[PDB]
Design a protein around this ligand. Structure first.
Ligand SMILES: OC[C@H]1NC[C@H](O)[C@@H](O)[C@@H]1O
Ligand SMILES: OC[C@H]1NC[C@H](O)[C@@H](O)[C@@H]1O
Ligand SMILES: [Mg+2]
Ligand SMILES: [Mg+2]
Ligand SMILES: [Mg+2]
Ligand SMILES: [Mg+2]
Ligand SMILES: [Mg+2]
Lengths: 781, 215, 781
């Protein structure tokens, strides 16, 4: 069995740099607390025992209420009068830092307005190892850079709005199967322990840990340790994971909270780096363990100060208002137990926090549409004589937009996946609705919507008369506690749901101007229809939230040129992706073993390595205009040589070998600041190229910079930077970025540091991972 | 909208009866669509549409939260060559279709500002719910053709004051109407005899003559 | 609020009389044990941790494995190669002590053969206060005497087979609504405590406690305390209930186990009379409480010796074999964790324990058929020209006989309710199958089966041509953790399921020889069709288990004359029964309050009090022959006067105010022996009458003896005795029974004892509660 070595003591905060003010105030607060009060900050109150998805204990003596921790990564869960934003995978498809930031801000606003202290998101774990992983859509992209950049922007948005963000799930939670034994037992599996994600040190550093480093460096206030084990130690009591990787190497200054009921070694978890136990025994035992010296006072002091530093860092002292909604009822009033008898109290204020957030949701919707094919199908005008709309995915959830709890169904248009990663829709504009409005406000031609996937006779009938047929298909997935159609969180296949492929084929056989819109959580196998000559256009539109239909028509009818690029690969087969899902336990009754044997070769890296050609490669998308790439130029910057970090920490302040050691500790060679040794972010090269709009309409291009690191075990290419750029017809721009030292380095397990190998490196600039228009060597120095 | 030949079904919003007396819709604006367009172009409040008469739980939970609840029920009929749900052209009863009455009662039990919209080919028996105090308004909208949702919201939201009058009576019972429908032959293998014994006393003339009070 | 006074200390065993040998052996065993070993007996190992629905800890030092506690009241739950017996309500309809006993023995044989130590049954609570109570079918009858007698016979059968029986649920669990807070929350109610059944002392004694007294006196080894509260104290920590009523007044010598997760005040439960905690985290707390003196040694000792006394009483020492099946999988092998690594072990031996029990299951099926109406419909011959069979209740469960988890559906023929009170069918003979077999082996006329309740055209089609039409309808219910069709355990109405009434009306409109068969867990409202002249016969057949179709046709085709009597009333309205189900919390977030305001006036007692006429009265049933009653005689037996119990216990041996008192305690005046003061069972009168079969075929009659106690608040009549008697044409018998002192007594709260009031009493012998053919005074003496 793969093994996780111990690493103690649990590092205490430095409170240097951007964390100094927050640390100073956290220290002044914690100094005033009893042991009991400090412990309260670390202890969840109990599942459904208060208002939020999780709450800490309070400190009434100082008029300090317990923190409110609330889902989700795309909105405020279990709340009324809130917005439903596009999923993270949609954000990834925008390739747009600014939009990710603004989505974060708006979500932050909504959480703040409700009294939430901690938004439980965004997500960089799962990263996206498996194309059929159930919760990938909550995150961004299998690519660590795309994910890391947009993760960071999202965090800055949330925290700038005055709410603590929570990077989750740390780490290796790449599938839902066997994530939690009780859950697996519910599915008829006999195991007593969560699966172990077995990840080698190199793979961790270069893939899964990378976006979490970005999260740390972006100033995220909290992390959530995952349900699964990593090398046969539960994330939430994995000393190597938390004490070494997170709190030493990445020098995380904030607090680590457990996933809800994520198994840990109680008091041992605290020594291994856990700061907060959710949802709530730990309170009492922590108090006792401090009193008898099993847990040193500086540990509990550090737990409390991390929590309070996060609080002050985002300005919770300024922005906090009373929690004005209840997670567990929509009723205005409810009975509560009193010291004597009961009271009848206000539990929901129905505070409307939506503001103008429908605009940014429509915009991100449009920006996340990816044009995969267009042989003269798009844009439409709205003056078409006869428009046919086809597929259940065009239509309404007949149970109401919030008719499936936690969105645990696939009724009507798919705008959101299922599980904790959800929010209630204030409304839902369907494609059927938006398309009919478009026509009836313009040319007022014929339009008919056949939204029963079994009604094939009607689809032929209508398609054969149509000037254009717009076909809607979907594929759904979500968190493991919900099973839909035999998908136990994870997808059981990469097929279109509800006979979608049949809908496409039926319509395309009858209409030679067929448009296909895919609302999918991830890739599906399209080999059998994408190349159908009668299919004149194909878009992926993902999970667009409340404005789905409107955001779509803005693109389809040409008000917005599509500018998204696919943030994952569309392969010919499931086998193309490699990394099959473990769906049968392989360690008897013990922890199943998901070995990450493919290393860094997931998604496009795998395709490139094995020379499999994608149908649509990572980073690919079309426009209503054309772009041209020219004149790459590489400038060496002659950065200072890399210095491994060195020296000591301070002694642990007060306000398993080494676990009670509060003496000064040696700094790790790759640590020394939040996000890693600062020398890693030194700029080594400046790289430029010219992008020109050679077409006839204004449009966005997403230029992409890839690096070949040049070793035999390196990917042929890895994404390193990108931007989204609006260009008028004929307009040119010089796209200039820099490559950091980290950008051109490899992880060396022996030296425990990032190294620039002697293999020659090549830089590429292009429009996708396969359309590498420009290249130049990176000259060593 | 034209998915049932000669409109021989009761799928979704009822804007046309069945048989030869039909035409194809160029399009059909549903109440769901028009009401959402109305809200989203004005106050942009919350709006949800539960359009499955079996999803009574969802209706309870949405109706409990609503400022206003707008309930839609229908009853259909048509030419005798088409049978739908055991209605051989003629209606086998004067009930609302697809458990419409239960939809009304469910919603009304959870929302004290319930509006009922009836798309019916003729009268239905409403004795059980019309006088529900939680039902704050009732309209009959008939079979409005292609602009159904739009024509409706113009009235509901006050652009047009309603000025229609019912062109038939709404009675307490089927018996109120007299003139029972002959559904089994009464002359062997020969021509059945529908005797018009009531004379000129149909609809309101019948109610008036027997001093029966219409709803 | 209603209040439950304290009663301490928790009585310890006497081991007198019938328990002396068991007590002696239990003492010898417990004498050898450490404290930890004693506590192990009291502590369940945890939910699904071992093989049985529950297991105690083991004592391996002496080669003593943990006890195996296993559902259900009608078979071996969660096991293969077992039989599915008829439900308790069917046993009640037989009015047959002998059949009840033989069912006990057979179930006991099967449990024994699997290695089970405790069968978790039979059921006398719910008794049947509400006609819509979800679990009534697991019990017997709303009548306390009928239930008590058959309860006792079942117990004797199980225990005679070498298995410990368990009387449940004690007490007041008359509905599923709000039985457990978590479950109520799951259904969207906001409460934090179980409902409280508020029952006055007299009602308890004269109604709900009565059958449980019978169970004690029959020698039952264990009791299970219920989920609900009684007078605002949870049954399992209710000192009045367990210490006073059960262990003092009824002088119960066996052990009390909790219902699974039935809430108690932890260590204080033990002081209040709880002996065993299921399923499991109190083991170490009980150990500590004994060490620090909060729980006396004599108490834990008494707990251990009660458990072992039950063990030795039924001869577990002789009959125990290893547990040879697993509750949680049907796999033959499985993994188990070890001191190091894992062991692969045998988990299912597939031991076939069914023997010949299909015979008794068929016989009880037939004996539990109640003929409610017969105007020349029955019996059939099998030489009918055309037989129509109608209704889904005639057909197969299309998912397999065991295709619904815990029988939590209403697919095909209803032969068993849902929840924990179940077992798997080895097979299930449907009415469709058995009727076709009957026709095709005899006259070979036409036969067709329309088993889709929506197929009304086809029913009209076929019924028009039929010589006879046999219609099948059902109504289902069960345990509260399962909801079917909006029935949250309890029934939401007293309607037939799946449009059964429309089936009946459709068929009766087209066939003037329509027979209706009802498989219902309890009464339904039949007012609209029972008096239809086209309905020539009506039978209730209940939940017949595996031989349903065969047992039924044995009766329909005249091999067995029906002799069952309805063990509950068939009323005109729901309101007829009074006692409406509380389905809405009425104490805010606190325990709902269920006031048993009707007192002893449930089922027939209510109908009699209000002079309301039932459609079919309690105790009513027809035969293929006629019976005549004559010549009643009453013999006074001049019993000794009643003597209150006196004297004191011995002091508590070792091997809240009064809770730790181990000193000799005074015997309650209505106590003294298992089941109450022995003087209560003195015979006061012998009552006899002549029964004659005056018809042309052999049949069974169920003569019934009713008593009028004569007080202003007494029921007009209460059942006191009954028998089932087979009589050939022209055969006479003398039916003779005796009335005990208990039988003619009332409970007096002031004196805490049974009293024979001065009001004149009248005895009635008849063929139902309303058909009282003979009567006589009971001369005072
Ligand atoms: O609902 C709280 C918590 N539950 C479990 C999920 O894994 C996590 O993402 C979520 O934040
Ligand atoms: O299954 C164990 C246990 N669960 C709870 C039920 O109330 C009881 O009857 C049953 O024995
Ligand atoms: Mg609450
Ligand atoms: Mg540090
Ligand atoms: Mg096991
Ligand atoms: Mg005693
Ligand atoms: Mg009740």
């Amino acid at each position: 069995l793969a093994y996780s070595p111990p690493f103690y003591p649990s590092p205490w905060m430095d409170g240097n740099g951007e964390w100094a003010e927050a640390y100073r105030r956290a220290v002044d607060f914690v100094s005033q607390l009893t042991l009991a009060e400090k412990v309260n900050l670390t202890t969840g109150v109990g599942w459904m025992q208060e208002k939020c998805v999780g709450e800490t204990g309070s400190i009434p003596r100082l008029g300090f209420r317990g923190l409110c921790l609330q889902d989700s990564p795309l909105g405020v869960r279990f709340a009324d009068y809130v917005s439903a934003f596009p999923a993270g995978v949609n954000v990834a498809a925008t390739w747009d830092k600014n939009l990710a930031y603004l989505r974060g801000k708006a979500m932050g606003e909504e959480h703040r307005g409700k009294g939430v202290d901690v938004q439980l998101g965004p997500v960089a774990g799962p990263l996206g190892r498996h194309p059929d992983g159930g919760r990938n859509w909550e995150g961004f992209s299998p690519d660590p850079v795309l994910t890391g950049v947009l993760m960071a922007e999202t965090i800055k948005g949330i925290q700038d709005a005055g709410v603590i963000a929570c990077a989750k799930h740390f780490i290796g939670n790449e599938m839902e199967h066997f994530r939690q034994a009780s859950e697996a037992v519910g599915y008829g599996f006999d195991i007593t322990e969560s699966v172990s994600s077995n990840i080698d040190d190199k793979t961790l550093h270069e893939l899964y840990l990378w976006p979490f480093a970005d999260a740390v460096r972006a100033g995220v206030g909290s992390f959530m340790c995952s349900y699964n084990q990593v090398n046969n130690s539960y994330s939430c009591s994995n000393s190597y994971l938390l004490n070494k990787l997170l709190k030493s190497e990445l020098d995380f200054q904030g607090f680590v909270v457990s996933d809800w009921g994520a198994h840990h070694s109680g008091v041992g978890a605290a020594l291994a780096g856990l700061d907060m136990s959710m949802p709530g025994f730990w309170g009492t035992n922590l108090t006792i363990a401090v009193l008898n010296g099993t847990v040193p006072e500086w540990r509990v002091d550090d737990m409390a100060v991390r929590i309070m530093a996060a609080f002050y860092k985002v300005g919770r002292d300024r922005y906090q208002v009373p929690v004005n909604f209840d997670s567990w009822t929509r009723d205005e009033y409810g009975y509560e137990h009193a010291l004597v008898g009961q009271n009848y109290v206000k539990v929901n204020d129905k505070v409307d926090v939506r503001a103008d957030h429908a605009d940014i949701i429509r915009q991100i919707g449009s920006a996340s549409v990816v044009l995969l094919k267009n042989d003269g199908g798009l844009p439409l005008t709205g003056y078409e004589k006869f428009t046919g709309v086809f597929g259940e995915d065009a239509g309404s959830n007949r149970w109401g937009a919030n008719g499936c709890s936690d969105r645990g169904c696939d009724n009507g248009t798919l705008a959101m996946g299922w599980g904790s990663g959800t929010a209630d829709f204030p409304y839902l504009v369907t494609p059927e609705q938006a398309i009919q409005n478009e026509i009836l406000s313009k040319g007022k031609g014929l339009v008919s919507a056949v939204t029963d996937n079994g009604a094939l006779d009607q689809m032929e009938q209508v398609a054969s008369q149509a000037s254009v047929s717009i076909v809607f298909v979907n594929a759904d997935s979500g968190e493991g506690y919900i099973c839909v159609d035999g998908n136990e969180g994870d997808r059981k296949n990469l097929t279109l749901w509800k006979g979608g492929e049949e809908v496409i084929k039926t319509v395309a056989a009858n209409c030679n101007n067929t448009i296909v819109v895919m609302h999918t959580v991830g890739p599906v196998l399209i080999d059998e229809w994408y190349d159908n000559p009668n299919v004149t256009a194909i878009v992926w539109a993902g999970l667009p939230g409340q404005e789905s239909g409107n955001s779509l028509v803005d693109v389809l009818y040409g008000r917005v040129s599509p500018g998204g690029k696919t943030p994952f690969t569309w392969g010919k087969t499931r086998e193309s992706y490699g990394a099959p899902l473990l769906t049968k336990p392989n360690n008897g009754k013990g922890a199943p073993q998901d070995d990450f044997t493919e290393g860094v070769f997931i998604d496009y890296r795998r395709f490139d390595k094995y020379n499999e050609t994608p149908i649509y490669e990572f980073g690919f998308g079309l426009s209503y205009t054309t772009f041209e790439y020219s004149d790459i130029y590489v400038q060496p910057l002659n950065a200072r040589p890399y210095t491994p970090a060195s020296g000591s920490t301070k002694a642990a302040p007060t306000f398993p070998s080494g676990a009670t050691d509060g003496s000064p500790q040696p700094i790790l060679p790759a640590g020394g600041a939040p996000g890693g040794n600062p020398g890693l972010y030194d700029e080594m090269y400046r790289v430029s190229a010219i992008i020109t709009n050679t077409g006839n309409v204004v449009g966005d291009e997403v230029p992409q910079l890839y690096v070949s690191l040049g070793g035999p075990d390196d990917p042929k290419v890895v994404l390193r930077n990108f931007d989204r750029i609006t260009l008028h017809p004929g307009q040119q721009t010089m796209w200039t970025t820099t490559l950091t030292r980290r950008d051109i380095s490899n992880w060396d397990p022996a030296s425990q540091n990032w190294v620039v190998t002697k293999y020659p490196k090549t830089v590429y600039i292009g429009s996708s991972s396969r359309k590498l228009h420009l290249q130049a060597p990176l000259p060593p120095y």
